[PDB]
Amino acid sequence: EGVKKTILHGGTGELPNFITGSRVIFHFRTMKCDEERTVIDDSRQVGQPMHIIIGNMFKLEVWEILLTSMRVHEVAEFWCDTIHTGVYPILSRSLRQMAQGKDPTEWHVHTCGLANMFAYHTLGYEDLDELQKEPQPLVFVIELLQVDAP
Numbered sequence: 001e002g003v004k005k006t007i008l009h010g011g012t013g014e015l016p017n018f019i020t021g022s023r024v025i026f027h028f029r030t031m032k033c034d035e036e037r038t039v040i041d042d043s044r045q046v047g048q049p050m051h052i053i054i055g056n057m058f059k060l061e062v063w064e065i066l067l068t069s070m071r072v073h074e075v076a077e078f079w080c081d082t083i084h085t086g087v088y089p090i091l092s093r094s095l096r097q098m099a100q101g102k103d104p105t106e107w108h109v110h111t112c113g114l115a116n117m118f119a120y121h122t123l124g125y126e127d128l129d130e131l132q133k134e135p136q137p138l139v140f141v142i143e144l145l146q147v148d149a150p
C-alpha cells in the first residue's frame, strides 16, 4: 500500500523468474505529481538503461517490489506515496554519479561527496535539494527490458 500501479503497455509472456541474484534491466522516468509531470530523472535521456540485481527475493527493496511485478516489455506507471520518496534524492544523486563514471562507493568519490554535503549542505544538484526540502509523492514510469539469472 501507498502505491497504485497502472500498466501502460502490456508485456510479452508470464512473470519472469525474479529469483535472488537476477539481473533486472530497465528504463525509468521519475516525475513529480505536478500537473506538468516535471521530470526529475529519465534513464533514456542519459542513454543507457538501468541495471540492478535482486538482493534477496524474500526481503525486497521498494524498487524490487515494483520491478518484480512486471513482465518483459511491460511499461507500467507507479504512483508512490510520500512515505516512499523521502530517500529518492539520495538514491538519485548516487545514480547520477554512476552515470558520470564516478563510483559512489569508491574512496575518493564517497569522501568528496560527504565532505561536500557536510560543508555546503547539498546533495550536489539543485533539484534533488528542492525535492528533499519539500516531501511529496512521485511517479515512476518503468519499462522492463530484460531479466537474466545468476
Ligand SMILES: C/C=C(/C)CC/C=C(\C)CCC=C(C)C
Binding pocket: 028, 050, 051, 052, 062, 063, 066, 091, 094, 095, 140, 142
Ligand atoms: C545506488 C544503489 C542501487 C542498487 C541503485 C538502485 C536504485 C535504482 C536503480 C533506482 C530506480 C528506482 C525506481 C523506483 C525507478
